[PDB]
Design a protein around this ligand. Sequence first.
Ligand SMILES: CNc1ccccc1C(=O)O[C@H]1[C@@H](O)[C@H](n2cnc3c(=O)[nH]cnc32)O[C@@H]1COP(=O)(O)OP(=O)(O)OP(=O)(O)O
Ligand SMILES: Nc1nc2c(ncn2[C@@H]2O[C@H](COP(=O)(O)OP(=O)(O)OP(O)(O)=S)[C@@H](O)[C@H]2O)c(=O)[nH]1
Ligand SMILES: C=C[C@@]1(C)CC(=O)[C@]2(O)[C@@]3(C)[C@@H](O)CCC(C)(C)[C@@H]3[C@H](O)[C@H](OC(C)=O)[C@@]2(C)O1
Ligand SMILES: [Cl-]
Ligand SMILES: [Mg+2]
Ligand SMILES: [Mn+2]
Ligand SMILES: [Mn+2]
Lengths: 330, 189, 189
Amino acid sequence: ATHRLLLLGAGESGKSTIVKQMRILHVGEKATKVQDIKNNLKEAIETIVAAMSNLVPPVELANPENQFRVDYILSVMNVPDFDFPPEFYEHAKALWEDEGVRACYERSNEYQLIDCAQYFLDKIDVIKQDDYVPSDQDLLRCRVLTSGIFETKFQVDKVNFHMFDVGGQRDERRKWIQCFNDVTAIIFVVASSSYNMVIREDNQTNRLQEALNLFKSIWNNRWLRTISVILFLNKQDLLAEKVLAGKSKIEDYFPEFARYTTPEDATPEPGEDPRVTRAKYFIRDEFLRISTASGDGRHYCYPHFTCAVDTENIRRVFNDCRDIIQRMHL
Amino acid sequence: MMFHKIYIQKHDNVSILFADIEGFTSLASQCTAQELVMTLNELFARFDKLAAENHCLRIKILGDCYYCVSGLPEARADHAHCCVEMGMDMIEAISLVREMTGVNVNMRVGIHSGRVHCGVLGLRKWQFDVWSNDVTLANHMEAGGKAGRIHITKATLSYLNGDYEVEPGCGGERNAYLKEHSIETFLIL
Amino acid sequence: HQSYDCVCVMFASIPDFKEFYTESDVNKEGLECLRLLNEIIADFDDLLSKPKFSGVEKIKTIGSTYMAATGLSAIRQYMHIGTMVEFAYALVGKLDAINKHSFNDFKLRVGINHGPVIAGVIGAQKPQYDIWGNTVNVASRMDSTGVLDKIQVTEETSLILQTLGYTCTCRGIINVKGKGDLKTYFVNT
Ligand SMILES: CNc1ccccc1C(=O)O[C@H]1[C@@H](O)[C@H](n2cnc3c(=O)[nH]cnc32)O[C@@H]1COP(=O)(O)OP(=O)(O)OP(=O)(O)O
Ligand SMILES: Nc1nc2c(ncn2[C@@H]2O[C@H](COP(=O)(O)OP(=O)(O)OP(O)(O)=S)[C@@H](O)[C@H]2O)c(=O)[nH]1
Ligand SMILES: C=C[C@@]1(C)CC(=O)[C@]2(O)[C@@]3(C)[C@@H](O)CCC(C)(C)[C@@H]3[C@H](O)[C@H](OC(C)=O)[C@@]2(C)O1
Ligand SMILES: [Cl-]
Ligand SMILES: [Mg+2]
Ligand SMILES: [Mn+2]
Ligand SMILES: [Mn+2]
C-alpha cells in the first residue's frame, strides 16, 4: 500500500511544520539550521522596532536609553552576511526587554511578523551561545519559506506514505497542478489564529478569508471532485490565547460570529473555556459551510483542531488520518 | 475520470532530428505558391521514404520544417547512428531535389539525443508529436546549425560511438539557447 | 489539393507555458505539465463542436499553439472572418476558466489574417490536412509579434471587421521578414 498525500493551504499556515513532524515521528544535520534560527531572531526584533514609528499612533519606547540600540538594530537591518556579534544579542535582548517594544508586539497583527517571534526572543540567552545546539521545538519553530515542491517519503506500520510540500503563496500555487493526478487525499492547512491579520502577498486581504476562498477553490476544483480533504485547522494555541486575552475580537473582522452559538456535537477538550470552544468551532463550520454545499458524497471533508508545533497533538491527529485513509478504501 | 486520458508516455535513450529550409522566404519570392507546395511535397515524400530505411519515425511537418525521431515505437540501442545516417541521406536528397527548383535550396540539420514524452494532445484531429527539454534543444540545434551540415550535441556524440569524424560546431556562437546552456556542439564531416 | 480565394487563418499561442513547463522527479519529467496542456487543447477543442462554431476547421497544434481557419466550406460573405474572432474570444474564455482551477495567469496571444491559401495533404508516412500560402505565415507572424489578450490583424483584415461591427487600433509597423514592413492592428473589446 502507498498513499500520496498533498499539503495545501495559504502562506504560513504551517504546512512545512507538519512535514518535519513526520521526520520527527516516523523517520548531526541540525548544525545547518542554527544559522537559520539566528536569522529568524534577527528578522523578528528588527521587524518590531521598524514597525514602531509606522503605526497609528506610533509606539514609543519605555526607556529613552534603548534609543541607540534601536539605532543599532536599524543600521544593521540590511547587512548581508551578518556575523551576529555578542553585542547584537545584548541590544537585541534589551530591546525585547523594553516594554514599548512589547506593546508594539501586542500590535503585531497590523504589520507583518513571523509566528516564532515570542518563542525565540525569549531564548536569546540560549541561542547566543556558540556551544548552542537547537532542541526539536526550536527546529519546528524555525521558519524558512517553501518555494517549489518537496517529496519526503516515510513509513508507518509498514505502510508507505509519500508527502508533498509546496509553496503556499499566490505566485507559488501554479506548481500545485503537478500533484493533482493520483493523489490519495489532500491535507488543507489553515492558520486559525490569523483572523485579525492580512496576508503578505498584498498587505490587505484577510488571511483567513483568503484561506476560506482558497479552500473553496480546492473543494470545487475540476480535478478534485472525488479527492477527499483532511482539514487541519492549525495554530490552535495561538487562536486560544488571542481569544482569551480579548483584545482584537473575532466579530470585529468576521461579523457573522455575532449570531453563531456553540454546537451540540461539540466535544471540547477537558477544561477548555467555552469561548475557545465557541471560536474554533466557528472557524470549523466556516470551512464546513463551504463543504456542505457541493460534492454530494463524491468526496469528503475531515475537521481537525491542530497545533503543528506540538508533536503530541500531531501524533494524535495523523493517526486519526491514517485510520481514515484505510477506512474509506482510498 | 478527473483529467482526460493522456495518450502520452516517457521514452529514454532516444534521438530527435530537426531540419529547416535555408532561405525559404528568399525562395518564396520567385516561384508561385503552388510551385512551392509541389517542391515541398516532392521533397518530404522523398524524406518520408528515407525515414523507413534508416529506422526513423517521422513526427510532423511544419511548412518548411521537417522533423523525425529515432527510437520508436519500440527502442533501439543503435538509435543515434540512425538520425545521423538519416541526415546524411536527407542532405544529398535535397541536392537532387535542387535540380527541380533550379534555385539555391538547402537543408539545415540539428540532432540531439535524450529523453522524450510522446503521443497526442487534445481531442479532435490528432497528430503525433514529441515533447521535452531535450526536444526543445533539438530544434535549437537545427536553428543554430550550419547550411547543408549535420549539427549534433555532446549527448548525441556519446551515443554515436565515435564512428563519424566531427569538428567543433560552436553552436554557442550561433544560437542564444545554445550559449545560455553551455552546450558544446559538433559538425559531421 | 486545391487553392482557395478567401480563407481565414488563426494562430493563438500561450507563451507563458514554455517557462511553465519543467522536468523533474516531482512532476514526472514534465508529464504533469503536458497533462494540463492536454486539458487546455481539449477545452479548446470542445468548441469546434458548438453550433455557432461548426463552420470552423481545426487544422493543427504546434507545441502550445492553436492553429485554425474559417471558410474552407464554400465553392455576410466574410461572415466567417468575424466567426474566427468570435472563436478566438471563446478560446480566451476557456483559458480564463483553466486559470481559475490551475492557479495560473495564462494569456492567449492571437493573430488572424485572411486571403488566398492552398489546401491539401503532404507526406508519405501519414498524410495530414494542412494549408499553405502567404496568408498562413503572415497570420503566424501576427502571432509571434503579438500582444497577450489582444488579436493582431492585418489592415485588410481590420477593414472588414469594421464593416462587421468591430473597432480597431493601429499597432504600427511590423517587419514581416521577406515581405517587408507591414502595418498591423489590434482589435478592441
Ligand atoms: C509566400 N509564402 C508561402 C507561399 C506558399 C506556401 C507557403 C509560404 C510560406 O511563407 O510558408 C511559411 C509558413 O507558413 C510555413 N509553415 C510553417 N509551419 C506551417 C504549418 O504548420 N502549416 C503550414 N505552413 C507552415 O513555413 C514557411 C516559412 O517558414 P518559417 O519558419 O516562418 O521561416 P524560416 O525562418 O523557417 O525560413 P527562412 O527565413 O529560413 O527562409
Ligand atoms: N504557536 C504555533 N505556531 C505554529 C503552529 N503551526 C505552525 N506554527 C508556526 O508558524 C510558522 C509558519 O509555519 P510554516 O510551516 O512555515 O508555514 P507554511 O504553511 O509551511 O508556509 P509556507 O511555506 O506555505 S510560506 C512557523 O514558525 C511555525 O512554527 C501552531 O500550531 N502553533
Ligand atoms: C509545449 C511545451 C514546449 C516547451 C515543449 C517543446 O519541446 C515544444 O513543444 C517543441 C520544441 C517540441 O515539441 C518540438 C516541436 C515544436 C513545434 C518545435 C515545439 C514548439 O517549439 C514548442 O514551443 C511552443 C509553441 O510552445 C515547445 C518548445 O514547447
Ligand atoms: Cl492560513
Ligand atoms: Mg513552507
Ligand atoms: Mn526555413
Ligand atoms: Mn519553419
